[PDB]
């Protein structure tokens, strides 16, 4: 284990991501990871 | 002066009451401008030159993030 | 127009009006809720000390701080019938900066707080050598000297902000 | 004998001979879960352990592992192979109805040890 | 392996603790087998040191100190990011004054 | 690791405070001392 | 020991200037109040970040079909809190969301698909795919 698991997580994360990148655009998911990168700086 | 694709943005976005919260969904809220065109040719040519204009003249206008006239905010909703 | 209200005012009319805002907050202070976020100020003082990232503690009374001054304003202004508190009733996150930049706690004490304080120093012995005097001042540093200074100075940072109660106001003749 | 098991059941257990009789001839008949609620209910009276075994088990209408039957006879104490068959059952239910909450609710076992956790002492939080 | 002794131990566990507020829709049997099985499977680091009933009297004793009823515990860790995020968002300092 | 741990009511009715749990455990750690002996509950609780 | 007093000199500077920076925005020592205010702001940034997220799926949840809110629910629940907690399992995850989607077909199968055999086959099949009460060998003596 602790490598299908690993990626079983990043597919469910990648199903929520289509999810979200579907009904958004590319604009705001660049502005939105900017503002996460800076508040994590 | 709003229109029923921004109101339904708006609508779903709650527990903001700050003005700058709502600026923070400003290309989400700019997702109302839906232009429904055709794919024909000439209005894919009508397209490229209004996206050409709009770029030039938002140039020139050249307003920030924060002051945002033409994109609707709290006040409407 | 709060931050420079003195140079609007008399010096009685100053008085006057300063000393029912400060009458005022000493009368909120005394509440259950403000000395409970003065008592989890102090409480933490220790975790908070070692990072900038702040705590819920810290953001409990940091919280009371745009409120506060928006209080202090009113108490101040309350005389005036030109003044609309509508626009204070909500306000957006640089309003509410702006407001916070005109807040004083006028229960803390008024003097410097500058103090000295005298940390035992450890004296060299002549039967050890250079190098193992040094490891002995090394781990007398970073076991006895570093946390006394890093106490020294979180309490200084945070007696600047906790209050004088009541009794010591009285006690010292600063109140009533 | 389910209707005298039951009202022996109302009246004092575990300590009679009619009632002993009747549970002999019950036993003996092998009833499916007249037998085992029989059990359940003159064994209340005297203990609790097997009497609340037997009605855990029946709770599930578990037909195997009739070694009950001869068990609850003069149940002064437990065999063996009557702990051991309890054990089982127990392991068996638990694993189910922990397996069958976090199907259910895949954060349940994150909210339990959440919930015993928060207060202990730092040896514990290590772990 | 004496069995009495565990119905015992669990007898003692329900008569002193309600423990129907951990596990809702079933019987004091099986939630005391469950419980019994995910201490067995988070904490057997200290059952080869301390007695399993010890522990478990322990954890039960400390969790429904804290309150009889349903509690809601979420565990942050403060030196990450998104831990932390989430710390000094929920907490509020109005529900920690009313003990909520 | 250390880790903060919030608890909250669902109900709403208040916790009780640190006094409350050094007062809460002892009852029910004699409670348990009366039933079996030979335990280190003590130990374990400070 | 002069050496000493210097090294313990810069010791004391370093320390009063790490607890200036480390606790700032406790006391109003700096003019305007200003590095409390910064705090205060990195707060509210932090708040405005979560409440983002959550009105993204407000939105998300309004737009998709009424079929598929509970989906989106349970993935939005495994983006939030799921993943960062090691006793979630995902292999439970994803078969809660198996779970979900024979019963989304299910309920497809309800829209008058107007099979005759079909429809029982189907049925038989979910039913003993999610592992209800009916048995495997009941649909292979149906069938
Ligand atoms: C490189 C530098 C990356 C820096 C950013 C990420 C780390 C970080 O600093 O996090 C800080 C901080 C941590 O906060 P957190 O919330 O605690 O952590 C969230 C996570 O970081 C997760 O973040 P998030 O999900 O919220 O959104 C950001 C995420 C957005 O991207 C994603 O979410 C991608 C998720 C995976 C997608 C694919 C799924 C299926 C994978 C299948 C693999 C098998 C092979 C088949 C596919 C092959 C494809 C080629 O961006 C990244 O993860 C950056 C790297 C993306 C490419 C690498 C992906 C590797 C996946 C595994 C491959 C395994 C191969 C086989 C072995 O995160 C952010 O600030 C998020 C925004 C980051 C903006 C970056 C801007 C550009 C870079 C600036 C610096 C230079
Ligand atoms: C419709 C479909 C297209 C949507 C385009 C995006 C959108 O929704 O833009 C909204 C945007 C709202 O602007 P805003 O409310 O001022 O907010 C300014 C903020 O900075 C916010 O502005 P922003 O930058 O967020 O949005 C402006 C938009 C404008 O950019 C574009 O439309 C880019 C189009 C590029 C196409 C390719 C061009 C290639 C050749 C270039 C030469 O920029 C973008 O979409 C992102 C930058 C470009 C990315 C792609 C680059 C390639 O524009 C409109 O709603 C239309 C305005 C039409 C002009 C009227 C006024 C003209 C100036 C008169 C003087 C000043 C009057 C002031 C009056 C004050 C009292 C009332």
Not at chain 4, 15 to 29: A, G, L, P, S
Not at chain 5, 65 to 89: A, E, G, H, Q
Not at chain 7, 42 to 67: C, F, G, H, S, W
Request: hydrophobic residues 40%.
């Amino acid at each position: 284990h602790l490598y299908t698991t690993e990626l079983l997580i990043e597919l469910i994360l990648f199903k929520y991501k289509l999810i979200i990148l579907k009904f958004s655009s590319i604009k705001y998911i660049l502005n939105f990871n900017v503002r996460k990168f800076i508040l994590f700086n | 002066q709003t229109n029923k694709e921004w109101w339904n943005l708006a609508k779903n976005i709650q527990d903001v009451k700050c003005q700058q919260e709502l600026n923070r969904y400003n290309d989400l809220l700019s997702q109302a401008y839906t232009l429904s065109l055709d794919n024909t040719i000439r209005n894919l040519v009508f397209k490229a030159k209004f996206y050409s204009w709009l770029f030039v003249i938002n140039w020139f206008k050249a307003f920030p993030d924060d002051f945002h006239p033409f994109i609707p905010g709290l006040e409407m909703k | 127009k709060f931050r420079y209200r003195l140079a609007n005012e008399t010096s009685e009319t100053f008085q006057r009006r300063n000393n029912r805002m400060v009458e005022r907050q000493i009368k909120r202070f005394q509440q259950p809720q403000y000395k409970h976020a003065f008592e989890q100020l102090q409480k933490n003082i220790a975790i908070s000390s070692n990072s900038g990232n702040a705590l819920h503690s810290e953001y409990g009374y940091l919280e009371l701080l745009s409120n506060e001054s928006v209080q202090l304003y009113k108490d101040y202004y309350e005389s005036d019938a030109e003044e609309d508190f509508k626009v204070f009733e909500n306000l957006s996150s640089k309003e509410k900066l702006v407001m916070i930049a005109n807040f004083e706690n006028n229960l803390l004490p008024k003097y410097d707080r500058s103090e000295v304080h005298l940390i035992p120093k450890r004296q060299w012995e002549p039967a050890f050598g250079v190098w193992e005097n040094f490891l002995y001042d090394i781990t007398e540093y970073a076991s006895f000297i570093a946390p006394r200074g890093k106490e020294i100075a979180a309490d200084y940072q945070i007696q600047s902000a906790i209050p004088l109660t009541k009794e010591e106001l009285i006690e010292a003749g600063l109140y009533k | 004998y389910f209707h005298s098991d039951a009202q022996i059941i109302c009246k004092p257990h575990y300590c009679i001979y009619f009632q002993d009789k009747q549970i002999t001839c019950v036993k003996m008949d092998h009833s499916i879960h007249p037998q085992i609620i029989g059990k359940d209910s003159d064994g209340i009276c005297i203990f609790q352990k097997v009497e609340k075994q037997d009605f855990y088990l029946k709770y599930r209408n578990l037909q195997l592992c009739a070694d009950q039957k001869h068990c609850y006879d003069t149940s002064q104490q437990t065999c063996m192979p009557l702990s051991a068959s309890y054990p089982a059952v127990k392991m068996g239910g638990t694993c189910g109805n922990y397996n069958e909450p976090i199907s259910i609710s895949c954060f349940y076992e994150g909210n339990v040890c959440l919930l015993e956790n928060p207060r202990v002492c730092i040896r514990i939080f290590f772990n | 392996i004496n069995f009495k002794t565990k119905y015992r131990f669990y007898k003692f566990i329900s008569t002193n603790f309600n423990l129907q507020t951990i596990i809702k829709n079933c019987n004091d049997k099986i939630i005391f087998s469950t419980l019994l099985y995910i201490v067995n499977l988070n904490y057997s680091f200290f059952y080869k040191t301390i007695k399993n009933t010890d522990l478990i009297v322990y954890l039960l004793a400390n969790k429904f100190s804290i309150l009889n009823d349903n509690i809601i515990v979420s565990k942050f860790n403060i030196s990450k990011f998104n831990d932390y995020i989430k710390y000094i968002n929920n907490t509020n300092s109005i529900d920690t004054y009313l003990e909520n | 690791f250390f880790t903060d741990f919030v608890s909250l009511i669902v109900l709403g009715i208040k916790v009780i405070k640190r006094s409350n749990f050094i007062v809460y455990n002892p009852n029910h750690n004699l409670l348990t001392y009366c039933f079996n002996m030979l335990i280190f509950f003590k130990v374990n609780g400070i | 020991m002069a050496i000493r007093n210097f090294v313990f000199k810069i010791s004391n500077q370093i320390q009063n200037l790490a607890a200036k920076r480390s606790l700032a925005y406790l006391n109003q020592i700096d003019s305007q109040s200003v590095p409390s205010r910064a705090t205060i702001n990195m707060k509210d940034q932090v708040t405005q970040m979560q409440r983002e997220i959550d009105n993204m799926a407000n939105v998300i949840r309004a737009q998709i079909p009424d079929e598929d809110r509970a989906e989106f629910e349970i993935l939005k629940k495994y983006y939030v809190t799921g993943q960062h907690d090691s006793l979630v399992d995902p292999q439970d995850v994803l078969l809660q969301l198996d779970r979900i989607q024979v019963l989304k077909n299910l309920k497809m199968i309800e829209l008058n698909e107007e099979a005759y055999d079909p429809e029982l086959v189907r049925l038989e099949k979910l039913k003993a795919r999610v592992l209800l009460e009916e048995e495997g060998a009941l649909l292979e003596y149906a069938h």
